[PDB]
Ligand binder design. Sequence first.
Ligand SMILES: [Zn+2]
Ligand SMILES: [Zn+2]
Ligand SMILES: [Zn+2]
Ligand SMILES: [Zn+2]
Ligand SMILES: [Zn+2]
Length: 169
Amino acid sequence: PHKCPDCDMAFVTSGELVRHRRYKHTHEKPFKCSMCDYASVEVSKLKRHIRSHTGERPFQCSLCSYASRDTYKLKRHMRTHSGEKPYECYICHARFTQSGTMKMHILQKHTENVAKFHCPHCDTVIARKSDLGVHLRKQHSYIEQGKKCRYCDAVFHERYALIQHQKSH
DNA sequence: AGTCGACTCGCCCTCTGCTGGTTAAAG
DNA sequence: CTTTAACCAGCAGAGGGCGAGTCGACT
Ligand SMILES: [Zn+2]
Ligand SMILES: [Zn+2]
Ligand SMILES: [Zn+2]
Ligand SMILES: [Zn+2]
Ligand SMILES: [Zn+2]
């Protein structure tokens, strides 16, 4: 109460050091979940976790329909009504509602040697991983009822094969 | 008393991934 | 001009790490 053997404390309180040890060095994780293999250092965390199974959203935006699992997602939602933009690219001074959005802007706009993503099925590369997501869903997803070639009778079940086939035509 | 350890409530940060407007090239 | 799909900010999903304030419990 307090000092740390393996870290640079971060006094002071008996738990403010014990729990620190629990988080950063002795990964205790006493409380465990119902269905998943989850367990973590605080019960507050598990109470929050169980809503991913249940679906409880006990925090309403008095101004819209939204409802969040915990308090912070609502304070973060509130910025959209207030118009507050707390975050700032230090290079261009663009403003953003959300920290991670800013980090992503910096990564795509002011960063070099950043890794891309190559589609496994087709040969095109795109920058954000999530856009590789929408590309795999729109271009290499299974189309159940099929699509017919525009100029011949051949039917295809994936949009890529369809567009590729539409040659030499 | 005086010190916990356990209980609880709250602040703020990170990583992840989908959605829809824009834009620019290819039909 | 239309059609298309990557680019981009916006925005919501889950989880981690800290501060700090009540008490009954035990020396
Ligand atoms: Zn430490
Ligand atoms: Zn669970
Ligand atoms: Zn709202
Ligand atoms: Zn910038
Ligand atoms: Zn054909």
